[PDB]
Coordinates of N, CA and C in Angstrom, one line a residue:
X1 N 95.1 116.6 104.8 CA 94.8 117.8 105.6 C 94.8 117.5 107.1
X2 N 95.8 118.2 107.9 CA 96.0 117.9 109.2 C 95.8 119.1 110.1
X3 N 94.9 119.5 110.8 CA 94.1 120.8 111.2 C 94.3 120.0 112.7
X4 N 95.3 120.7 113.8 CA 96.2 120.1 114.7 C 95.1 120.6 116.1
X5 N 94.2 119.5 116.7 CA 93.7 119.4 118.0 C 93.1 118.0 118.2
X6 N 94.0 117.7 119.3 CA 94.4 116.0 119.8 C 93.4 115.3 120.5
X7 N 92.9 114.3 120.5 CA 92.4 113.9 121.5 C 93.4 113.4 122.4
X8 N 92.7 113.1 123.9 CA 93.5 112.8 125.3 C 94.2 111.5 124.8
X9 N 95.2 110.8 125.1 CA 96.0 109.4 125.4 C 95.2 108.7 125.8
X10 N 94.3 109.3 127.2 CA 92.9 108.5 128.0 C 91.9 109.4 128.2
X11 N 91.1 109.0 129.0 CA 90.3 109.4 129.6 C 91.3 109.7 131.3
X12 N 91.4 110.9 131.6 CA 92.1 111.3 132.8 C 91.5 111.6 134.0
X13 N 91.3 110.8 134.2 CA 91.0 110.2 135.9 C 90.8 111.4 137.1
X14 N 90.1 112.2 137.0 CA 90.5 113.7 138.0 C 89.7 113.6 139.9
X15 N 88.6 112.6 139.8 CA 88.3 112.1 141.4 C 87.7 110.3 141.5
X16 N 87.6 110.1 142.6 CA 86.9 108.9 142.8 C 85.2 109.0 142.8
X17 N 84.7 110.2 142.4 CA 83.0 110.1 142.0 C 83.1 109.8 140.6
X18 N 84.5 110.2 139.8 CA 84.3 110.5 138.5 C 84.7 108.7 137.6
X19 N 85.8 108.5 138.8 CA 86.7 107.1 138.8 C 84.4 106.1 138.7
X20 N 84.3 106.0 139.3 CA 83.2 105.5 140.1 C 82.0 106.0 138.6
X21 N 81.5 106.7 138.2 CA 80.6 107.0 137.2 C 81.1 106.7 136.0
X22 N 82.4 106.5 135.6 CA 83.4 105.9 134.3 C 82.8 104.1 134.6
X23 N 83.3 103.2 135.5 CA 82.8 102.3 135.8 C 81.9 101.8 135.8
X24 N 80.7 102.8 136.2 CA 79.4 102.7 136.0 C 78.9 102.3 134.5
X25 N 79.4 102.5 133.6 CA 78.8 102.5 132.2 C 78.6 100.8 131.7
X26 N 77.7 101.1 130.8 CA 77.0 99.7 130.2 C 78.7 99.8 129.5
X27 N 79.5 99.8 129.3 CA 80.5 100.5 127.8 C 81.7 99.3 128.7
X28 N 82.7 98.6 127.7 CA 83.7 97.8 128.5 C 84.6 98.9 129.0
X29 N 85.2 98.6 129.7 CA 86.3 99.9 130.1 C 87.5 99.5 131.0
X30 N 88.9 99.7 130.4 CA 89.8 99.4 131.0 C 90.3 100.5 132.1
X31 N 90.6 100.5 133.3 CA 91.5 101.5 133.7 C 92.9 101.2 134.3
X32 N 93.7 102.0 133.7 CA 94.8 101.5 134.3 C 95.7 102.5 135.3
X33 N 96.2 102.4 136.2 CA 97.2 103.5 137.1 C 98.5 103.2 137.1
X34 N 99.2 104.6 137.0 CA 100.2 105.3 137.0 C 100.6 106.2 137.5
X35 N 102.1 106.2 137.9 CA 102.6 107.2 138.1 C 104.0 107.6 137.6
X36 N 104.1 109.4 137.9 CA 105.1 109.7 137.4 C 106.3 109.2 137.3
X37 N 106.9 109.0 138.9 CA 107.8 108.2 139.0 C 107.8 106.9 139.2
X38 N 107.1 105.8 138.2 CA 107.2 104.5 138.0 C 107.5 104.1 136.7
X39 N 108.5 103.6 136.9 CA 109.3 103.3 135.4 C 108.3 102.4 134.5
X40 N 108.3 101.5 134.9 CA 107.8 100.4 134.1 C 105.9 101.3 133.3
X41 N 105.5 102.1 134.8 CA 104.2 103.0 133.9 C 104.6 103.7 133.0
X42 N 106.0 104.4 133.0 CA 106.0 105.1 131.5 C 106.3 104.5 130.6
X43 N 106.9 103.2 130.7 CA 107.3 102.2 129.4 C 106.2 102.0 128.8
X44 N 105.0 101.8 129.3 CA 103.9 101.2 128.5 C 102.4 102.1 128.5
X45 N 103.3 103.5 128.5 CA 102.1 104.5 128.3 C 102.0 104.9 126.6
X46 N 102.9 104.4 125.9 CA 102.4 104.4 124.0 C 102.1 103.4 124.1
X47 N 102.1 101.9 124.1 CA 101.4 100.9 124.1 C 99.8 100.9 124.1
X48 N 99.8 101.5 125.6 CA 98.3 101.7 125.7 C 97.5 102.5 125.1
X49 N 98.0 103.7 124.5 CA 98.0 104.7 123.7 C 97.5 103.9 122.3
X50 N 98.6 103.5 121.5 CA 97.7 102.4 120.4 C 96.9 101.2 121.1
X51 N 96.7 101.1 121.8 CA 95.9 100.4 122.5 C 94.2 100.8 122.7
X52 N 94.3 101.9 122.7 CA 93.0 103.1 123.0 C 92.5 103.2 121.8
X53 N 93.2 103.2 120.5 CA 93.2 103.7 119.5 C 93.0 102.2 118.4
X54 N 93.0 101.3 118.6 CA 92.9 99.7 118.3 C 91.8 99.2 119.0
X55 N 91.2 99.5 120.2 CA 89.8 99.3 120.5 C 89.0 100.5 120.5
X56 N 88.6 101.1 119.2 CA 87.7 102.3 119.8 C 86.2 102.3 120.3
X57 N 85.5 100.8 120.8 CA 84.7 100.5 121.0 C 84.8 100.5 123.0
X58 N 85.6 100.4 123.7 CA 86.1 100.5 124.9 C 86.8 101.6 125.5
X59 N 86.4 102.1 126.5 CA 86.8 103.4 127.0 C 88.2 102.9 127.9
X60 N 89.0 103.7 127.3 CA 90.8 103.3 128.2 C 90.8 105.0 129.4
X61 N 91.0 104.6 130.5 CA 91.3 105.6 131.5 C 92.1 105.2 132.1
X62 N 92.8 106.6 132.6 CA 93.8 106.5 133.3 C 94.2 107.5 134.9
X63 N 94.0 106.3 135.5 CA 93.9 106.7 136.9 C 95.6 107.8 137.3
X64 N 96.0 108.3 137.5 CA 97.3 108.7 138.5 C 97.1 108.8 139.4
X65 N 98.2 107.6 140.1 CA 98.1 106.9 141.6 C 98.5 107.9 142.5
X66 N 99.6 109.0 142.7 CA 100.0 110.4 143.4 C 98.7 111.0 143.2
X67 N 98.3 111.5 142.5 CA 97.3 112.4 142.4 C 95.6 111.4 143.2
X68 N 95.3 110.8 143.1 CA 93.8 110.0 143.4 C 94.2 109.0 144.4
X69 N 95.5 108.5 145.2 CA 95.7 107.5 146.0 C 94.4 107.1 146.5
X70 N 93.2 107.4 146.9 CA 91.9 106.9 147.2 C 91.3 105.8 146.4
X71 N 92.0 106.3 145.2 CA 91.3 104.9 144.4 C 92.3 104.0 143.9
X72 N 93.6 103.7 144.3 CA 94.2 102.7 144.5 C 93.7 101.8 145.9
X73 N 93.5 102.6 146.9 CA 93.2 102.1 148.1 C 91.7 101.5 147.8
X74 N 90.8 102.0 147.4 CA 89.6 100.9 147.1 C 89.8 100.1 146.7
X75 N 90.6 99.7 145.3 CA 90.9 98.3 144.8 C 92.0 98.0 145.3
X76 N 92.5 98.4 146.7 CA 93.7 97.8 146.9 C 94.6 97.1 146.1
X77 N 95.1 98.3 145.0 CA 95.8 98.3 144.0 C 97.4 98.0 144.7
X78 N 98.3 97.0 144.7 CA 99.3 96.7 145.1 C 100.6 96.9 144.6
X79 N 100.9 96.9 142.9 CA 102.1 96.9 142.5 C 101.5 98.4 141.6
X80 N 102.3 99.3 140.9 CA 102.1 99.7 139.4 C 103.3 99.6 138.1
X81 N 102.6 99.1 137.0 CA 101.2 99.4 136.6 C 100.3 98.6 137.2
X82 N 99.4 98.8 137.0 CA 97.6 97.8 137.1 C 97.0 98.0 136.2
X83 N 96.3 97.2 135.4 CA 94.9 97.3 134.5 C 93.9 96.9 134.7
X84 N 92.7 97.7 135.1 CA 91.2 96.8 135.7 C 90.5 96.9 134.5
X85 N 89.6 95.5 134.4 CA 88.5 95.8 133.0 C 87.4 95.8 133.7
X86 N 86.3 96.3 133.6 CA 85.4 96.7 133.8 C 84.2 96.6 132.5
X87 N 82.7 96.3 132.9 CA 81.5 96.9 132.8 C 80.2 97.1 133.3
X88 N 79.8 98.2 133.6 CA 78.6 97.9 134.3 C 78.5 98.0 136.0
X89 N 79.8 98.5 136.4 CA 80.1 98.1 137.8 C 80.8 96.8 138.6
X90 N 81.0 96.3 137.2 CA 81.6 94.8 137.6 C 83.0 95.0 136.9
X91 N 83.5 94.2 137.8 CA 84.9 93.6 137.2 C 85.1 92.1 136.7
X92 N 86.1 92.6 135.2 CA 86.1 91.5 134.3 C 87.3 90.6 134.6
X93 N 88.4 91.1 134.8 CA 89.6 90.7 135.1 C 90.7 92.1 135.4
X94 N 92.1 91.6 135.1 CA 93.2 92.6 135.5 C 94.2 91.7 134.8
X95 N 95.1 93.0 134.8 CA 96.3 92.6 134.4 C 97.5 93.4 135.2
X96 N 98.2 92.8 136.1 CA 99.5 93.4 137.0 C 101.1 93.6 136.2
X97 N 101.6 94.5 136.7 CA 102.3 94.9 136.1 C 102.6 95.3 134.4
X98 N 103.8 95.5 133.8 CA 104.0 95.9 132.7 C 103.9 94.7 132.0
X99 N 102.7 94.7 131.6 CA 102.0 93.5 130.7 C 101.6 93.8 129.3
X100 N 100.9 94.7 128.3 CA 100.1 95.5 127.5 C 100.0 94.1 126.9
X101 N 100.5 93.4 126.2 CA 100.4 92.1 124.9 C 99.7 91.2 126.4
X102 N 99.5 90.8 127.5 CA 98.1 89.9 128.2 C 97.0 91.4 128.1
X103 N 97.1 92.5 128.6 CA 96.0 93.1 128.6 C 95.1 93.2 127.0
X104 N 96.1 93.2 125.8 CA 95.3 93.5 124.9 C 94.5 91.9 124.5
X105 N 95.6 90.8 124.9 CA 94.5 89.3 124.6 C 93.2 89.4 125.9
X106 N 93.4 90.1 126.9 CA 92.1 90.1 127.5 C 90.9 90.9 127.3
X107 N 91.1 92.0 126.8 CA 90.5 93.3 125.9 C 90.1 92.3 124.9
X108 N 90.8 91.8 123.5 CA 90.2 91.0 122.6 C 89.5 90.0 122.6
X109 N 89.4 89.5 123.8 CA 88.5 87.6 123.9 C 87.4 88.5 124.6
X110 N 87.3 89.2 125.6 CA 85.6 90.2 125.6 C 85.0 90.4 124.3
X111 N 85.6 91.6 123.7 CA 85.0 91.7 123.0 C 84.7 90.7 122.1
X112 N 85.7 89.4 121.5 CA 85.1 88.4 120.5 C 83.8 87.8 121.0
X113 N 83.8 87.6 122.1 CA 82.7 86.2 122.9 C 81.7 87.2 123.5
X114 N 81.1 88.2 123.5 CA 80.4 88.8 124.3 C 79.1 89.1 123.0
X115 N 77.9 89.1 123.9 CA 76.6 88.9 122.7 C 76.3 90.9 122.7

């Protein structure tokens, strides 16, 4: 039985109060930015997609860099893609560029080693 209403790809990123209260959480959380016209971002927007869907213990968001440029400029975000991990307000590490196979071994060794 397939009764058709989707959830999001991410969590979609709509200001920097909301960018900023997503971070905030006790919860791990990756975010990553994109945009339209960046190739290498849409190569690895299904990746992350089963990626979202392979940790469902970790919130995946997704910044778009045209639309929120304020919050590339906070993390002086330099190339895209980008992946930030996050919890709690802190940052765990990153991953630059079109990487998903390092972001998902860095996503998996948190969650293994963490109490």
């Amino acid at each position: 039985v397939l009764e058709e209403d989707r959830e999001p790809d991410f969590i979609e990123v709509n200001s920097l109060e909301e960018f900023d209260e997503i971070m905030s959480m006790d919860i791990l959380t990756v975010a990553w930015f994109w945009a339209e016209d960046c190739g290498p971002c849409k190569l690895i927007e299904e990746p992350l997609r089963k990626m979202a869907e392979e940790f469902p213990n970790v919130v995946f968001a997704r910044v778009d860099a045209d639309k929120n440029p304020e919050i590339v400029k906070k993390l002086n975000i330099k190339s895209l893609p980008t992946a930030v991990i996050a919890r709690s307000g802190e940052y765990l590490g990153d991953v630059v560029g079109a990487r998903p196979d390092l972001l998902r071994e860095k996503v998996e060794n948190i969650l293994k080693n963490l109490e």
